[PDB]
């Protein structure tokens, strides 16, 4: 760990907050290379099979186990968190790379979320449930009350029930919501990162990361 790298100075999850940590350049550089292969694996499977298939569910689960992504699943959590914020520096350089990095990270969350328990999803009535059953079936399990404004793509196509300014969405459709608001915050962060970069860009220690994209 002779070489060192300050992340704080340099800067399933939405990767909102940067990591405030000092890490080795070897961890840094290797951790990048690790996640790169992962995203390239997602892109190959996305072309090969179709998301949802057990093979896809089985194969990506393997590569993730391979690339190391309670405290048992904590070491990958730190790896996944930090690895992502490094690649932000790589793929913010161009729309193609941004789109590419996004699209792979997009497909990533789907799977990570596909293998998620319903209990934890909520964290990250029964009479009223059955009372509005008909009104929703005709429009478009658990259902959540969102301000309609945040459900734009849904109600603008009449794929959900509205009442008193709030949408009533299923768990099937709520995926693309979180998936898209995330797509915005990320493409936003990338756009920001694209501003932050040309001060550190010249750094040799970052050369292999900015070239071997």
């Amino acid at each position: 760990g002779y070489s060192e790298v300050n992340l704080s100075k340099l800067f399933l999850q939405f990767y909102l907050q940067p990591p405030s940590e000092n890490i080795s350049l070897i961890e840094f550089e290797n951790l990048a290379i690790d996640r790169v292969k992962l995203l390239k694996s997602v892109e190959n499977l996305g072309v090969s099979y179709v998301k949802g298939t057990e093979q896809y569910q089985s194969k990506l689960e393997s590569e993730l186990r391979k690339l190391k992504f309670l405290e048992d699943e904590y070491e990958p959590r730190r790896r996944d968190h930090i690895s992502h914020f490094i690649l932000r520096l790589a793929y913010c350089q161009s729309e193609e790379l941004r789109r590419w990095f996004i699209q792979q990270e997009m497909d990533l969350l789907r799977f990570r979320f596909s293998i998620l328990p319903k209990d934890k999803i909520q964290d990250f009535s029964d009479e009223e449930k059955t009372l509005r059953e008909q009104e929703i079936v005709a429009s478009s399990e658990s259902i959540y009350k969102i301000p309609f404004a945040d459900a734009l793509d849904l109600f603008r196509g009449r794929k959900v029930y509205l009442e008193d300014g709030f949408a009533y969405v299923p768990l099937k459709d709520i995926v693309a919501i979180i998936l898209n608001e995330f797509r915005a915050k990320l493409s936003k962060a990338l756009a920001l990162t694209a501003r932050s970069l040309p001060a550190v860009q010249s750094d040799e220690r970052l050369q292999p990361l900015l070239n071997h994209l």
Binding site: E135, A138, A149, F155, R156, Y161, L162, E163, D164
Partner: protein
């Protein structure tokens, strides 16, 4: 009415009739926020069709002055900007942006020209006005029930249709994308002229449509089949046949020829359609295409839109942009609307009174919400 008498009527109207009192209560919104009224944009049209915008004012008195001073023919209301419109020459490019605006709708009869028989172009009659009526009930219901909007003001355009101003706090802050999304939520009539059938429904009907249909049902017979008589003849009922599968044109063609009035013919259509389902919602697609509102998205899409001000005067009809009682909508009559020529008469002796009361009733409930 004579539009040459107009420039004199305005002076008197702007000086002794315009309800500046209730007007300021509105745009300042209880003064809870500073520079709210002061950052509001307006635009005036003077003689010889000279147009100017980016006009703003300090307060009610400052307004009352420049208006009777300028005597404009058209007054449009814009958005709330980051600064003063009349100071836009000092602000640098990129900082002068519209930040807030009421949600608005502009409904025009011209968009129904393909589905009305009574009138043409800009001409209108009581027999077609039921379209505007149904449109309000359809829309006002949705905004209240589906969107939970509590403060909804509808206003006659002065001629060809009606406007709506939604002034709820949460509404005035809504983004352009949300504004656009609701238009799509409300819009069913899709197509220009190349497309004859502008409505297609799936087997499963979204409630917003279901509820809107049940409204149209209550007006359809007297409007469509009696007043309009859309099945008077072949020239008329063929247009309907364009909205249905070819496999039943002949069958209905006969029943129409064997029939005497549009009511009988419409009843036939229902039976054939109902029988066709058993063997889809052809009945409702037709009612909708003829009665459901058409929306120009552009007016509500843009936050920077200048729309005709309420209590403004239509330079040709002389009619006033008057408030409307949703509770007494069916009884509304746009021909019984006070003209500027009529109320200036009353002042030198108004009929404007009862409509202003409605606007105040709107302002009163607006304060309570702002408070409690």
């Amino acid at each position: 009415f004579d539009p040459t008498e107009l420039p004199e009527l305005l002076k008197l109207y702007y000086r002794r009739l315009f309800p500046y009192s209730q007007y300021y209560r509105w745009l300042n919104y209880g003064g809870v926020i500073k520079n709210y009224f002061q950052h509001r944009e307006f635009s005036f049209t003077l003689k010889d069709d000279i147009y100017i915008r980016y006009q703003s004012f300090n307060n009610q008195s400052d307004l009352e002055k420049e208006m009777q001073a300028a005597n404009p023919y058209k007054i449009d209301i814009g958005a709330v900007y980051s600064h003063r419109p009349n100071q836009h020459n000092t602000v640098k490019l990129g900082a002068f942006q519209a930040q807030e605006k009421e949600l608005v709708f502009d409904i025009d009869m011209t968009d129904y020209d393909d589905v009305r028989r009574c009138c043409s172009s800009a001409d209108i009659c009581p027999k077609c006005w039921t379209l505007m009526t149904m449109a309000i009930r359809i829309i006002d219901r949705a905004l209240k029930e589906d969107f939970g909007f509590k403060h909804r003001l509808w206003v006659y355009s002065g001629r060809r249709g009606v406007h709506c101003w939604v002034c709820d706090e949460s509404v005035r802050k809504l983004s352009s994308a949300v504004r656009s999304g609701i238009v799509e939520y409300l819009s069913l009539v899709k197509g220009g002229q190349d497309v004859k059938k502008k409505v297609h429904l799936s087997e499963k009907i979204h409630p917003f449509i279901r509820k809107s249909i049940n409204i149209i049902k209550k007006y359809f017979e007297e409007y469509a089949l009696v007043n309009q008589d859309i099945l008077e003849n072949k020239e008329s009922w063929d247009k309907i046949l364009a909205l249905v599968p070819e496999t039943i044109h002949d069958e209905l063609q006969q029943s129409f020829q064997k029939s005497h009035n549009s009511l009988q013919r419409w009843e036939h259509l229902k039976k054939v359609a109902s029988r066709y389902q058993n063997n889809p919602w052809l009945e409702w697609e037709i009612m909708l295409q003829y009665c459901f509102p058409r929306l120009d998205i552009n007016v509500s899409k843009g936050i920077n839109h200048l729309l005709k001000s309420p209590f403004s005067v239509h330079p040709k009809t002389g009619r006033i942009s008057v408030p409307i009682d949703l509770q007494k909508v069916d009884q509304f009559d746009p021909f019984t609307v006070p003209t500027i020529s009529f109320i200036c008469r009353e002042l030198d002796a108004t009929s404007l009174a009862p409509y202003v009361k409605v606007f105040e009733h709107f302002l009163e409930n607006l304060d309570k919400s702002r408070k409690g």
